[PDB]
Design a protein around this ligand. Structure first.
Ligand code: MN
Ligand code: MN
Ligand code: MN
Ligand code: MN
Ligand code: MN
Ligand code: MN
Lengths: 339, 339, 339, 338, 339, 339
């Protein structure tokens, strides 16, 4: 078996405009000062330009070396934002424009083609940095029709997954030639939001060997789904791990849908590590038992706790849950049995 | 203090092409042969024309007299379809067009105005028939944004409920003029899908006394919501009752969202009476103790059982769960409490 | 979907020396009077001669015709006894001698070969009777070593299952020629006692298409195993069904092993239908949904109830749980998905 | 009430060939460096010679005195291996030979007699060392017939327990002479594997006052038995305590029997302290309230964790769960009851 | 084992002043018309005079013969009312005065001495009727001090139980002479309200062989006590059985104490058979397995249902839960064990 | 939202005769040495004289001054003893006399009015010390009648609650004039023992704005009541917080009532922090979310643990559970909703 690497931290929730949350160098020193050994880097042109990194290996060698001076390593790159723009339903076109470059706002086809190019540059930059996995979202074409009311016409869902496979298969081929695994995070508001849809997406891509899963148990808790049985079924396809807590406390007034309430008042909400319902002892045990060769990446989000306390407690929490791992005599065996 | 009336049956799920599921005349005879004493009638021009009924009391008196000869009475009228069209998000324009008259398809503003007029004529026809309650849907403007991804802009939800109240307050005033309660069914794909949103809608209408609830526990089971505490909280506003069973069996592959699966394979699905998880013994007990003065109406749906068997077993099921209900001395009281 | 056939009854627990429990005809009239429409017949020479049935088509046609006069048909044949003798560990040699003919006692190799011939004759007799399935046990070579104390030497388990496949593959080849499925009952005291061991046996037979499962949930309840999840995993290999109830009530004095206690005092014990813990509503629902084309066969056993009352109630219990089963406008679909 | 003594550790799972896991002296210093105050010693002739210890008081005082210099005390002696060999069914004769001295392998009668003598020497050696309890197994004659299929002939189970009591009664009488309690660990693969069988064995020995229980909740979890109710029923016969964690997670493929799977894949498996299902807070509370005068001895076993990490964490775990313990006016009572 | 006799019915909750609820003769016919075969008779002078029954066997012979002509038998006599008055705390003196004859109201010691004499006459009258058990209450001296606030002085509890033994031992000696078991019903408002207090009472009476228990699971449910484990511990002292249902649904507003609420609103309340939480299948199985030689007597009480429907349904409920019950070869055994 | 202040400690369980448990100065040094930042002081004459404090602000300023030199502040005052004596049923007259000054023993009416004076003087002293909250008990008139056996006569409960308000309303008006909240601790042996009784008392005082709740989850656990839903309902009236653990383990011998057993053997008993069943993570989260501006005060009690070890561990336990807290584009919103 294998000892899970960590602790690491996802910087997306901590970027800002002042120090030390403004540059990658400063975020690396901040993370290393708290006890983390790795970082998951979002590909924002301010922090990490994918186009320069995909063009010159030298650009990547500078980033890698300068982070290693502080004691930090890049675990994976993140294209959650760009992956979302690969497939967008028109009802959400304007809500997502704030995630695209300003010059592309109001131009949906140009925004989609820019996102596909970003994903392909992410494969090449990952090879330069020596990374084995990459984190992303899948986008959503059919999410407005998640509940069968009004009744979904015949062929609607099948067309959505055929189109989704047609758009991601070229990108998946690019990750093959660079030897990088593509890990989708199953998340509400995506067509890939549970295990059934991931199996359906696989068949639409010809069972591509680079289509894998980023495991985050919090989203399964928020929809009352067994996150531990998920590991038992899909362990062969799990290549990345988000450590994130959540709780679901249904009342007589609201359930999973949430009633348009804010995060503080929803029955299902995210919590700081240790303050939710996730059995992280069981999660780390199963990942250790199924030979998971990856990083335990903290993705922090809480409805109550101050952000600087959550980032500090996460490092100790992860390090306490990581587990350090440790002839045939036919004739005799024949005698022991009836043979 | 009140014995729940019943058993009754909602005819929406049983209309067909040939006898006895084609006319209101035959459906009443069919319901009476199975043991039912009342019917909930959908307002489809083939079965019940609201315009003719709101204009001529004789039309209403004629239908009532014919049904009473077989031994059946109208419990309530249904405008689920028309109530839905009062508020439609553009993403669903074509999916709902099959529910409007053919000449209104493709004309969103004309369809919405036809729906408001249908609702007002139903309030007058309900007085003509001597009915106390009326069942309907609320429509949905914000359902595509039920999950906060992408993040909801400030004021989006509050504008949706302000608009929803603006459209229903004129209709609610018409129901007040006729002395009829309007009962919304909390349902996925509606802005009113749990108790929290109903409370928000009530405030947006100024606590209008005609805004009430049609209680159907099956939809609460499908979103992992406590359907028994719901009765304890909102019993003062519950004026109608749907008897409908359902089950929720989460797996390691899917949860409440369902993964675009059909009804047979979804973790949460409807089942025939007695084959689900709803504790109907407790449901009838709570309604009986809170003095529910209405009808127990069967709304049948199952992924497995044949509809002829479901309708037959329903009548006996409801009858077994209905419950038949049954100065001051001071001087002594002062001695017992030692003054 | 398919409607489960039944109710049927397994005669093994009711055969005796006095009427109406002495002959196959008397048992057939007794079963038909109680409401059963099928019977599972153990292959006891007193009841059914495998050697005569495998040799003459007339013998089988004779039995079938007489049973059809009473209204009963043979569901499957049973070789639980003979199947057990295909693999016996020396520690149990004498305890099993009462199940073989008297002349074969004391001779383990001749007894084992007599059992192989019995299994092969059952495949021929099943074709003559027009049967599609056959029920049996697997035998046990490694059951004394079910708990790893003393520690099992390397290769012991792999050799036991290699021998089982070596002995059953010739028999399974005979069942392929006659077109009959062989259904093993997962049972304690057999090497095939749960789902993991069945998968191991399958690979030892070259993934043979005739190796299938007889599903009996009671044995899973007695060892605290999720009998409903078993159906979701193995439904493609389930071809027979035993309806049998059981309960498991652990105390501070005893658990699954039972402490050599009798059936009345064991924490886990069999109970008459309806008096145990098995959720038969869920069992029949899952079997109906996965297109099970078999019989619901009652195998009765209880620690308290009189056997005559148990036989009388089984037919009604099983009958209440059986469930009677019931273009694409691309252009529109592309507009709905904004393509 | 009594404060449970500890933390202590059972050395059986840690003996090896490299230092400090080779000799009793090295194991005692290793345990003391990790924070333990006691050790449970397996009586293997290469680790602790029972025949020499039953003959010479000086030998025991040497071992005891040397260990006290390190800061360690012997909690009890262990004859799990030898106790198993007092009663062995022929189906397991060869599988158990690896636990007997080389000269006894293949000679079932000589092996059983050597084991009976080992148990009797353990009583004297415990008296010399000033120990009150002794840990052992009972052996098994009827374990292959634990499930009634094929059906057990009449008198089979009764004969097995009659022979078991007949073999242990002489040994138990020797433990009475030395004033030492004999604590059986209820364990699968023994005839004594739960509370019902222990009560049956107690009667077959004439309710012998020296037959007691070593409480280990992990074995009860793996067979889905209520380990907390066990303490409420048998607390008066509980004289030793193993702290050991375990979990039972049934699936749709396997249950308690386990399907011949290894420990990593079994539904019910042992886990390091704190990583299982045992409510140790409740266990220590019940033992404290029932006046348990013993040691909390760690018996470590895990399917995943490295043995060096498990031994290091156990001492702190045990320390956090130990609980430190702290004329009637008749006329007035008559007035209150009027 | 023994088959539990029944169904029987306790007449205390149904006696009134109008026919057929006024005389024992009319009540016996009413019970027989509903399907009951036995009755538990309260010892109220209007229905059954103890002074006349304890003095003349002929009076007892008259009632037995008159009841046997309708098809009904007396199961046991009840002195619940009188047994309470054997021990009363002064705070409740006036509240219980309504159950004694008017001439004793005011004199506590005369009322208590009247109750002791009533109990002794019930012992002789039960022997005359051929009854082997007798139902009663124990009274309470320390019930106002059930919660240790204010703290209890030393010796208070021990004195109360010393007084109970002092008062009941003479009565228990009288039941020994007549050969009748005295069955206390563990009930709130009594000193004997659970198993711990019954054992303490047994200690204060010298382990008197006539002190036994009337088992009623509803009172254990109302205080969140394991009623099934109770049978396993005390089955050797259980001689009578009340079939009575109850439920306990704690909220965020109230618990076991109940907040002085009425029976309709209490979290713990009594319910008609089948409408509560009691697992009667488990209760009847355990009583059958421990050889209970008594009657299943219905004691009816519900917060909602009409008393006539409950009495009609009780007989069928009891009928479906009653369970109808059904050398050594040393040498061979020595070979199987290996000597 | 606001961060809960703490850790603090209630000194009532720790006062003694020798140092440091004899004087308030010594108790403050002992409490501060263990890590506590606040203290709850019982109003015992030997420690804090209400008369001198209600008359002289300087006396109060001394206690504030000298305690601040140690690092400790007075959180609130406690008049649990005096509050109990405001309403006493005669059955407890002698048991409670030990809490009044020696001259008041046997003087009931003087004991009651002495307590009213203590309560009113406590408001002044709280006004002087700058405190916002005050802890007390309510007393009990009807606690002997908590179970309706014997049946409660009409008007008994209503008169008891009418008298409670008549006695407390003058005291509550005094707390109004000083600006201090009066927090009742819902406790067994009081008329205010759950949420339902608190609502009844509130209605009897004219919804007095100064009548509030001291939240202690241990007492709800001991009567099997949902302590987390209590917070959701009454959070507006919760002004004080006791950190106290407890467990409830029902057996087959005893339940909630306890059978007059001692604390070590009762099914429901108090335990040291962390050794009970209270989910304190959820409690602190709910109090943080509902804007609780108060103190987390440890009230220690355990059946097993030594009092020193409990006081030392309590401070660290509370610290780990305290949570440190942190235009509208109508046109865009109108486009997202379609209209
Ligand atoms: Mn994530
Ligand atoms: Mn409905
Ligand atoms: Mn079977
Ligand atoms: Mn152990
Ligand atoms: Mn009763
Ligand atoms: Mn408190």
């Amino acid at each position: 078996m294998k000892t899970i690497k960590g602790p690491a931290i996802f910087l997306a929730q901590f970027v800002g405009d002042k120090a030390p949350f403004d540059t990658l160098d400063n975020l690396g020193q901040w993370a290393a000062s708290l006890g983390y050994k790795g970082i998951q880097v979002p590909t924002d042109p301010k922090l990490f330009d994918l186009e320069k990194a995909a063009a010159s290996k030298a650009y990547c060698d500078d980033i890698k070396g300068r982070l290693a001076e502080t004691g930090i390593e890049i675990t994976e790159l993140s294209t959650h934002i760009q992956g979302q723009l690969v497939s967008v339903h028109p009802a959400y076109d304007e809500m997502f424009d704030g995630f695209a470059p300003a010059e592309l706002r109001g131009r949906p086809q140009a925004r989609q083609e820019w996102a596909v190019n970003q994903l392909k540059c992410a494969a090449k930059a990952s090879q330069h940095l020596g990374l084995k996995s990459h984190a992303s979202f899948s986008g959503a074409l059919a999410w407005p029709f998640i509940y069968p009311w009004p009744q979904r016409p015949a062929g609607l869902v099948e067309m959505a997954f055929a189109e989704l496979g047609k758009r991601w298969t070229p990108i998946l081929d690019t990750f093959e030639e660079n030897g990088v695994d593509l890990c989708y995070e199953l998340h509400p508001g995506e067509d890939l939001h549970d295990g059934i849809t991931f199996e359906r997406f696989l068949e639409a891509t010809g069972n591509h060997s680079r289509a894998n899963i980023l495991y985050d148990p919090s989203h399964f808790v928020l929809q009352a789904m067994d996150y531990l049985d998920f590991i038992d079924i899909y362990h062969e396809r799990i290549r990345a791990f988000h450590v994130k807590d959540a709780e679901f406390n249904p009342t007589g007034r609201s359930g999973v849908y949430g009633g348009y309430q804010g995060w503080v008042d929803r029955p299902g909400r995210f919590r700081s590590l240790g303050d939710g319902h996730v059995d992280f002892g069981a999660v780390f045990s199963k990942l250790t038992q199924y030979d998971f060769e990856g990083w335990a990446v903290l993705e922090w989000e809480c409805a109550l706790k101050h952000p600087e306390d959550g980032a500090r407690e996460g490092a100790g929490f992860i390090e306490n849950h990581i587990i350090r791992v440790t002839g045939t005599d036919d004739a005799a065996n024949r005698r022991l049995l009836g043979l």
